[PDB]
A paper describes a structure:
To now unambiguously confirm the binding mode of compound 13, we determined the structure of the 13‐RORγt binary complex using protein X‐ray crystallography. A C455H mutant of the ligand‐binding domain (LBD) of human RORγt was used for this study; the region surrounding this native cysteine is important for crystal packing of RORγt in complex with allosteric inverse agonists. Of specific and notable interest is the folding of helix 12, in a conformation precluding coactivator binding. The carboxylic acid of 13 interacts with Q329 and two backbone amides of A497 and F498 located in the loop between helix 11 and 12 of RORγt. The binding mode of 13 to RORγt is comparable to that of MRL‐871. A first notable difference in the binding to RORγt of both ligands lies in the increased bulk of compound 13 toward helix 4 of RORγt, resulting from the methyl substituent on the thienopyrazole core. This induces a shift of helix 4, correlated with a displacement of helix 9. Compared to MRL‐871, the benzoic acid moiety of compound 13 is orientated differently in the pocket, which is connected to a change in the overall fold of this loop. In particular, F498 changes conformation and thereby flips away from helix 4. The structural data imply that the lower affinity of 13 for RORγt relates to additional bulk on the thienopyrazole core pointing to RORγt helix 4, which leads to changes in the overall protein fold.
Nuclear receptors (NRs) are a family of ligand‐dependent transcription factors that constitute an important class of drug target. Within this family, the retinoic acid‐related orphan receptor gamma t (RORγt) has garnered much attention as an intervention point to treat autoimmune diseases such as multiple sclerosis, psoriasis and inflammatory bowel disease. RORγt plays a key role in Th17 cell differentiation. Numerous small molecules have been reported that effectively inhibit RORγt, which is transcriptionally active even in the absence of any endogenous agonist.
Author numbering: 267 to 507
The structure:
């Protein structure tokens, strides 16, 4: 009954209601690998069809990270300008981090559209360098054997960062940040997992992986606009034009 144990519980609950797939399912399907015939059917698809499918997954992924944020104790109580600043800087960073649950270190494959496949699945997109950076990142984290609670509390801190430029109420954002930071270290202490703090990616590795990812996604949307199931107008306004 400390406000801090309540926060851990309300963070982990929000994550559980928004994580799309259960970790038991992802681990049960690791033997369910795309065959050579199935990979080739993906390789043979138009760049722009692969772009449609991925644009769909990544949009859905963003919207689940938004709902995650809207269920974090204190988020809803911030002002709209600050909510949007945090989601604009952070929502896809969280998406990149969430992906590691779907990543199998042993064969270097990712759960995509029902089965596990290697980076060669996405050859028709032509962003071999970005896709290779996304696998490497996911590898780094998957080695750490990130647990559901560690992802939940870490991603919350990815979002609630009071150093994001353009916040109006810096002190209100600092109070949540401090509380979530305490939630995280408290948990890592109770689980003898403080050892991961030294192994996390630097803030810089994730910022730049994400800004290129968004850059590429923005170039695709310019060349080949997708139709988005827009749920959150203030944020969608900042990313589409
Ligand atoms: C920090 C953020 C990056 C980013 C966000 S937020 C959203 C998004 C999505 C939906 C809504 C909504 O209202 O439903 C709002 C925002 N898309 N997106 C992308 O990079 C993106 C994607 Cl995933 C697909 C295609 C093109 C692009 Cl540019």
């Amino acid at each position: 009954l400390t406000e801090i144990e309540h926060l851990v519980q309300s963070v982990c609950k929000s994550y559980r209601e928004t994580c799309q797939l259960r970790l038991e399912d992802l681990l049960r399907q690791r033997s369910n690998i795309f065959s050579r015939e199935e990979v080739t059917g993906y390789q043979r698809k138009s760049m722009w069809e692969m772009w449609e499918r991925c644009a769909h997954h990544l949009t859905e992924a963003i919207q689940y990270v938004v709902e995650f944020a809207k269920r974090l104790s204190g988020f809803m109580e911030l002002c709209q300008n600050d909510q949007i600043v945090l989601l604009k800087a952070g929502a896809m960073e969280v998406v990149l981090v969430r992906m590691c649950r779907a990543y199998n270190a042993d064969n270097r494959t990712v759960f995509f559209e029902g089965k596990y496949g290697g980076m060669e699945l996405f050859r028709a997109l032509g962003c071999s360098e970005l896709i290779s950076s996304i696998f490497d990142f996911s590898h780094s984290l998957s080695a750490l054997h990130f647990s559901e609670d560690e992802i939940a509390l870490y991603t919350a801190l990815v979002l609630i960062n009071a150093h994001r430029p353009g916040l109006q109420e810096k002190r209100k954002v600092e109070q949540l940040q401090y509380n979530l930071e305490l939630a995280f270290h408290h948990h890592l202490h109770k689980t003898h997992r403080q050892s991961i703090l030294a192994k996390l990616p630097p803030k810089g590795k994730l910022r730049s992986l994400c800004s290129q990812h968004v850059e590429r996604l923005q170039i695709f949307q310019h060349l080949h606009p997708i139709v988005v199931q827009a749920a959150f107008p203030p944020l969608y306004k900042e990313l589409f034009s």
